[PDB]
Ligand binder design. Structure first.
Ligand SMILES: Cc1cc2nc3c(=O)[nH]c(=O)nc-3n(C[C@H](O)[C@H](O)[C@H](O)COP(=O)(O)O)c2cc1C
Ligand code: SF4
Ligand code: SF4
Ligand code: SF4
Ligand code: SF4
Ligand code: SF4
Ligand code: FES
Ligand code: FES
Lengths: 215, 441, 78, 114, 120, 79, 209, 123
């Protein structure tokens, strides 16, 4: 599940080098400046993020190198990126399937979504695709509970899915050049009711300037 | 005094639906940053005494009076610490059921920025960090642009609104840990350690984040802060009951006809709420098996109770339940409750930080028990054994996650004992009899 | 020890001699045969050892499978 | 009657050097030397019962968690010297070799009441 | 049997009898003077809770004697808590008192002529 | 019964101390057992009182022994 | 500078600001514990020293609840005895059956303390059974069998604080938490065979013999 | 001090050859209990040649010293020392070594360090 012991066979070494890209190095200096000059260790969370942006995953080399950068022993970086779900320490493909399985997705049919996805592919929810394109991951509540069945490609949540409509998006991502705009299949804007807008049916705001406390 | 169905001139959030625009200038037309100078130039005492009059409870799930909370910030010798002190926005809301961290901050981020400024004035607070759930990259691309607009307009920074008061807003993104929603695990995560909680009597107002005094408020109880300072406080206090005052956005999800996110009054009937904004339950009012107010960490209300129950803190605490985040997850009559709570137990096993032995050992234990009880591999005794194990976990944890892991099991045992018995009698018919621990004979 | 719950007479002689001590012994054979018969008929079903395991040993069935009974076994014997 | 160190099926010594039979003996007859091999498993270099001073209480049978020492029901083993009467590991493994099927039968018939 | 090893409702401390053991009620020469003069938790003779402890502490230090406590004792004290209520000394007490039958007829185990009786 | 009886034994021993204040130092009861705490020059009169009174007629020595505690200045206690 | 309070009817006076476990040690009241130590930092992991405190809703951890005046502390509440049976029972469910082969036979802190406060019976009789958490090499001086660990953080609190060797750590969340280096690297400090008399269970013990 | 070595029936060598030791037992470093550290143990220092030696047949730890497995427990050091010189033995009182009181706070685990952090807690 979490699995925490690191295997030292190949492509994960302290010996294989890693350096920041200069845009990434400039952004790293900018993020270290957000915190007091004492507690520059507090910038360990959003900076292995930068390592997750440049390299496809979080190697042992990026954690060693960010530990070198921030004046830390390496185990204090090791604990932080072990405790978190979102630092994937294994190599994945390009598109990270994050299908939500929590009860609000479940009472509205995330089972059929997952079955359609893993019948289109042949892989397990911890397995990646042999093409190194898709990587399944069942995930818990992504915050889109009203968009009751949903999932997530790498940063973009895709929502309101039907099992027939889902496999379309799967081959859309498989073919290369077909993402959706970011929301669902155009059934609503962001979170309104599906029939329509019941309330806030005004073309203009009413100001707070006439509605003041006076003291 | 029929609670609910408020007017369009009443709603504090107007940008919930992408109509008015989240722009700085569009927020000027909405009514944001209108009289900021006059409020900041007035003291912290008046802002705290104004928020005390409204009865602004905590919208994080704890339900604490926010004026009292902001009054722990100043002991009468708060001056002699003479360093940097600040405020934390709990913009992490990863709770099963809620969608409102996304609906404050992909809809109206400038109310949040001015809520940070207008609350940190009352807290004598030199800065503020906002903790966003790291799942939201899109939202993190939105909020930073809003804060850069507020920097470029000179409303905030080294000299906020010409008031001689400095205030810095930064964004910290937390890479996927739901235990970090707790306030002190939030503190330790913002410190840059592993995000585990700490123990209570070092209160965060006394010595908190970076060893400096700092408290933690939800994104809602700080986003309501600028409008409640601009409006009257006694106007806010005219809604809900006497102690439960004002409004709240409600996320209703689950098996309704139309899942929505509304914003309404407290102390309202549940059935009127569901009729007004879901269009009814998918199959009628006959088609409810149970309802969950708040997130998953609340026991289930059964059929006969949820007819005349009010949506405040009092009328749910009286029926031994929580308002939570006021997420409303109804359950189909045609669908399993035991599935709906086995998933909650597996959720809490994945999302426990693993610090104290009863919570970490216990949700593993409860997940094994619920996976046994779902197929029905038990004796009739073991579900009250499970109730004893709920009381084993409940009152003995650091954070309230073990408290949160107690409660849905309690709702299941109190309200759906014959359903579990029926599933177990099915397992007793289909295959042979079963010993304790699922072993067979 | 449930000599209360079981009916029983006692023989007691007159003279202090050695014949009466013999005679009381001869009577106690019969009294104890009476007790053996009443204990066979009035025997109930129950546990034979005391209920807890901080003073006597766990059964070797569940000394293994339980963790605590393994602990109790080892501490009652070392 | 006389002691025996049992074995597993598929041939294995079954005394795991756990030292309980030595700690319980009301006459201190047991003497065990324990050493660990490379494998990580535990056995006894030297097992010993002095039968001049064993008193036959059967506590040593009752204490061993893995059921490695028992009381075979043999009594016909009277010897002519005392050095014969000091049982080392080899003699008791031989006694567990010879008495096995009647030993296993007696333990299986005893096993409900234990 | 099963009610000792049920899996629902068995805290060990309710069926616990090794810890709920009695203590030896040891009585000094002096605490009996305290029983004769202070009184008892059944029948106290002490008011003024602040000056109570002061009246206690001289007896606890060795103020009054026991023969003095017996001379100062009233007849109600002596016939209530030293002697019995009828002025009699108490009998050496026995837990379960044993009343004796004598079986005499044909139910006896020896007929008349043998000297052994068969009491009950 | 048993609660009443141990409370009766307490009172009997309180009487035994009050009848002979020169010789009896203490008494202690623990579960229907009565111990009388007596000086060594005080043995013979207390034992005559235990043999001879009609309320107190014990008539029959069962067993006597000592026990040493080396941590006390008077080492053995003879019971 | 001192504070008088009540523990178990006894009255006791201790310096201000201390922990309640030190007041319980001073008064003579035996309080069970697993992750507290006299020379180390305070953590509230182990959850054993829960104690009944007047003006408190829940039983508080006596190792990290600071001493306040007018304090009334009870340790023999039935809620406290229930609490100790509960926590002990939680500790003993995937701890492995190793006492015939464990090092700490008669010296195990967890084992002696499962008698004075532990439950008699164990209900863990689930099919899918125990967690495993297979071990890892540390060095030639410290034998490591991490199945028997109870995660009291005491080893890593020591190697951080006093030994000055920060290689040890806690990597994971929930049931998949492990203690120790996971590079498979060597714990070096010049006072390193000291963590084995510190661990209350037999997880870190002697390797050379 | 009455000399009781002539009345106890012990031989002379037990009073004029062997040295004995008063000690309170130390707290074990392994486990955190302190129950056996209140009574004062009287125990004999070993003799050179007659302590213990390996047997030739099996390897039995045969002894020649006869006070090797005797200990006593006293309540106080004064009772132990009065008994030790009453029997006419040569003692050595070993004084106990307690722990030092030091105020602990859970709030020590985080403070605002103004300079170098010089340390990172983990918990
Ligand atoms: C496991 C746990 C998870 C929590 N998650 C959240 C969350 O996601 N969003 C939130 O606003 N409060 C959350 N809380 C409650 C926080 O502690 C809350 O910020 C604090 O208690 C009260 O803040 P308030 O006054 O703004 O309501 C959580 C609490 C616990 C124990
Ligand atoms: S309640 Fe569970 S998740 Fe929370 S601090 Fe305790 S052990 Fe960790
Ligand atoms: S039978 Fe008794 S004396 Fe003999 S070895 Fe076993 S425990 Fe010892
Ligand atoms: S016979 Fe039993 S007690 Fe003796 S060493 Fe072998 S396993 Fe241990
Ligand atoms: S450390 Fe654990 S397994 Fe080992 S002997 Fe002690 S309680 Fe048993
Ligand atoms: S390794 Fe040992 S001392 Fe460290 S937490 Fe685990 S059991 Fe405790
Ligand atoms: S419940 Fe599936 S994302 Fe919120
Ligand atoms: S020792 Fe106090 S809780 Fe761990």
């Amino acid at each position: 599940h979490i699995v925490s012991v690191h295997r030292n066979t190949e492509n994960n070494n302290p010996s294989i080098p890693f350096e920041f890209s200069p845009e990434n190095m400039k952004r790293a200096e900018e993020v270290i400046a957000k915190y007091p000059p004492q507690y520059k260790k507090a910038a360990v969370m959003p900076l292995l993020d930068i390592g997750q942006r440049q390299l496809g995953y979080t190697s042992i080399s990026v954690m060693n190198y960010v530990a070198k950068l921030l004046e830390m022993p390496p185990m204090r970086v090791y604990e932080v990126a072990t405790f978190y779900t979102m630092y994937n320490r294994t190599p994945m493909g390009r598109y990270h399937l994050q299908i939500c399985t929590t009860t609000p997705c479940q009472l509205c049919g995330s089972d059929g979504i997952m079955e359609a996805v893993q019948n289109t592919l042949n892989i397990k929810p911890g397995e990646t695709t042999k093409d190194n394109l898709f990587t399944l991951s069942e995930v818990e509540c992504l915050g889109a509970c009203v968009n009751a069945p949903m999932m997530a490609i790498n940063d973009d949540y895709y929502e309101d899915l039907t099992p027939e409509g889902t496999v379309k998006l799967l081959e859309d991502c498989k073919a290369g050049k077909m993402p959706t705009p970011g929301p669902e299949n155009h059934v609503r804007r962001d979170c309104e009711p599906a029939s329509g807008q019941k309330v806030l049916l005004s073309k203009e705001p009413h100001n707070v300037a006439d509605f003041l406390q006076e003291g | 005094r029929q609670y609910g169905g408020l007017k369009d001139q009443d709603r504090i959030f107007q940008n919930l639906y992408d109509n008015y625009g989240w722009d700085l200038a569009s927020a000027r037309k909405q009514g944001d940053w209108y009289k900021t100078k006059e409020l900041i130039l007035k003291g912290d005492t008046w802002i705290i005494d104004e928020i005390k009059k409204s009865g602004l409870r905590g919208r994080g799930g704890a339900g604490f009076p926010s004026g009292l909370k902001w009054s722990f910030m100043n002991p009468p010798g708060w001056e002699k610490n003479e360093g940097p002190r600040y405020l934390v926005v709990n913009a992490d809301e990863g709770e099963p059921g809620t969608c409102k961290d996304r609906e404050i901050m992909r809809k109206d981020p400038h109310k949040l920025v001015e809520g940070c400024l207008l609350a940190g004035r009352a807290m004598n607070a030199t800065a503020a960090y906002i903790y966003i759930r790291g799942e939201f990259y899109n939202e993190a691309a939105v909020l930073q642009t809003a804060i850069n607009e507020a920097y470029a307009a000179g409303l905030i920074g080294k000299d906020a609104c010409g008031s001689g008061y400095d205030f810095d807003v930064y964004i910290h993104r937390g890479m996927g840990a739901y235990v970090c929603g707790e306030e002190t695990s939030l503190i330790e995560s913002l410190e840059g350690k592993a995000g585990k909680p700490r123990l209570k009597p070092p209160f965060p107002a006394g010595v908190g984040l970076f060893g400096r005094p700092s408290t933690v408020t939800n994104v809602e109880t700080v986003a309501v802060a600028p409008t409640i300072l601009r409006r009257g406080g006694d106007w806010f206090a005219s809604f809900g009951r006497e102690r439960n005052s004002g409004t709240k956005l409600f996320c209703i999800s689950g098996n309704v006809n139309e899942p929505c996110t509304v914003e309404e009054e407290m102390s309202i009937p549940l059935r009127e709420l569901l009729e007004k904004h879901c269009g009814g339950i998918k199959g009628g009012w006959d088609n409810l098996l149970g309802v969950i107010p708040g997130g998953c960490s609340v026991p289930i209300l059964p059929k006969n109770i949820c007819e005349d129950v009010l949506m405040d803190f009092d009328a749910l605490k009286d029926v031994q339940s929580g308002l939570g985040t006021a997420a409303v997850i109804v359950i189909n009559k045609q669908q399993d409750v035991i599935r709906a709570i086995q998933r909650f137990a597996a959720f809490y096993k994945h999302e426990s930080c693993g610090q104290c032995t009863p919570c970490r050992e216990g949700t593993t234990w409860l997940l094994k028990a619920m996976d046994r009880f779902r197929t029905g591999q038990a004796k009739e005794r073991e579900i009250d054994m499970l109730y004893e194990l709920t009381k084993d976990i409940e009152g003995h944890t650091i954070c309230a996650l073990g408290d949160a892991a107690a409660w849905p099991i309690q709702g299941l045992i109190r309200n759906f004992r014959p359903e579990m018995e029926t599933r177990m009698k099915k397992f007793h018919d289909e295959v042979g009899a079963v010993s304790v621990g699922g072993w067979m004979k | 020890d449930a000599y209360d719950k079981v009916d029983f007479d006692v023989p007691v002689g007159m003279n202090g001699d050695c014949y009466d001590r013999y005679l009381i012994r001869m009577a106690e054979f019969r009294q104890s045969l009476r007790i053996i018969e009443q204990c066979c008929n009035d025997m109930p079903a129950g546990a034979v050892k005391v209920e807890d395991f901080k003073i006597n040993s766990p059964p070797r069935n569940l000394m293994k499978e339980d963790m605590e009974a393994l602990i109790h076994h080892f501490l009652l014997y070392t | 009657g006389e002691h025996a160190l049992r074995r597993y099926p598929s041939g294995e010594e079954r005394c795991i050097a756990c030292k309980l039979c030595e700690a319980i003996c009301p006459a201190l007859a047991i003497t065990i030397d324990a050493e660990e091999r490379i494998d990580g498993s535990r056995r006894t270099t030297k097992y010993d019962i002095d039968m001049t001073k064993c008193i036959y209480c059967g506590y040593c049978q009752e204490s061993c968690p893995v059921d490695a020492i028992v009381e075979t029901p043999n009594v016909e083993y009277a010897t002519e010297t005392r050095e014969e009467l000091l049982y080392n590991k080899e003699k008791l493994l031989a006694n567990g070799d010879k008495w096995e099927l009647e030993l296993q039968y007696a333990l299986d018939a005893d096993a409900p009441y234990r | 049997s099963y009610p000792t090893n049920d899996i629902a409702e068995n805290p060990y401390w309710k069926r616990d009898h090794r810890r709920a053991y009695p203590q030896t009620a040891f009585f000094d020469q002096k605490t009996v003077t305290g029983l004769l003069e202070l009184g008892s938790e059944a029948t106290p003779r002490i008011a003024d809770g602040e000056a109570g402890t002061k009246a206690l502490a001289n007896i606890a230090n060795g103020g009054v004697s026991f023969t003095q406590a017996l001379g100062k004792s009233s007849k109600d004290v002596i016939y209530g808590e030293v002697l019995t209520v009828n002025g009699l000394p108490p009998v050496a007490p026995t837990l379960a008192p044993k009343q004796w039958k004598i079986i005499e007829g044909e139910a006896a185990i020896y007929p008349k002529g043998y000297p052994c009786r068969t009491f009950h | 019964r048993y609660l009443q009886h141990v409370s009766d034994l307490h009172q009997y021993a309180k009487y035994i101390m009050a009848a002979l204040p020169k010789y009896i130092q203490g008494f202690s009861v623990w579960k229907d057992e009565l111990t009388l705490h007596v000086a060594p020059s005080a043995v013979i009169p207390v034992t005559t009182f235990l043999r001879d009174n009609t309320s107190t007629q014990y008539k029959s020595i069962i067993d006597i022994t000592a026990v040493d505690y080396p941590s006390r200045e008077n080492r053995f206690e003879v019971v | 500078a001192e504070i008088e309070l009540t523990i178990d009817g006894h009255k006791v006076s201790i310096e201000a600001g201390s922990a309640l476990i030190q007041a319980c040690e001073k008064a003579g009241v035996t309080v069970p514990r697993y992750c507290y130590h006299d020379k180390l930092a305070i953590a509230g992991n182990c959850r054993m020293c829960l104690v009944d405190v007047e003006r408190a809703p829940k039983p508080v951890a006596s190792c990290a609840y600071p001493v306040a005046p007018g304090m009334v502390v009870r340790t023999d509440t039935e809620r406290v005895k229930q609490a100790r049976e509960n926590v002990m029972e939680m500790m003993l469910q995937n701890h492995p059956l190793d006492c015939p082969v464990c090092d700490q036979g008669g010296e195990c802190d967890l084992q002696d303390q499962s008698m004075r406060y532990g439950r008699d019976r164990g209900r863990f009789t689930e099919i899918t059974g125990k967690r495993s958490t297979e071990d890892k090499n540390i060095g030639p001086l410290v034998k490591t069998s991490m199945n028997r660990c109870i995660h009291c953080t005491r080893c890593v609190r020591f190697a951080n604080d006093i030994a000055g060797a920060p290689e040890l750590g806690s990597s994971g969340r929930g049931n998949d938490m492990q203690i120790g280096t996971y590079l498979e690297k060597n714990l070096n400090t010049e006072l390193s065979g000291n963590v084995i008399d510190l661990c209350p269970v037999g997880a870190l013990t002697n390797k050379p013999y | 001090v009455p000399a009781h070595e002539i009345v106890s029936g012990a031989p002379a060598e037990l009073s004029r050859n062997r040295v004995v030791r008063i000690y309170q037992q130390a707290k074990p470093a392994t486990q955190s209990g302190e129950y056996g550290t209140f009574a004062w143990r009287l125990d004999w220092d070993i003799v050179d040649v007659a302590n213990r030696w390996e047997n030739d047949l099996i390897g039995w730890q045969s002894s020649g010293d006869y006070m090797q497995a005797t200990q006593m427990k006293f309540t106080s050091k004064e009772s132990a020392i009065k008994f030790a010189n009453k029997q006419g033995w040569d003692f050595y009182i070993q004084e106990p070594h307690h722990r030092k009181f030091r105020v602990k706070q859970y709030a020590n685990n985080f403070v605002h360090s103004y300079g170098k952090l010089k340390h990172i807690r983990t918990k």
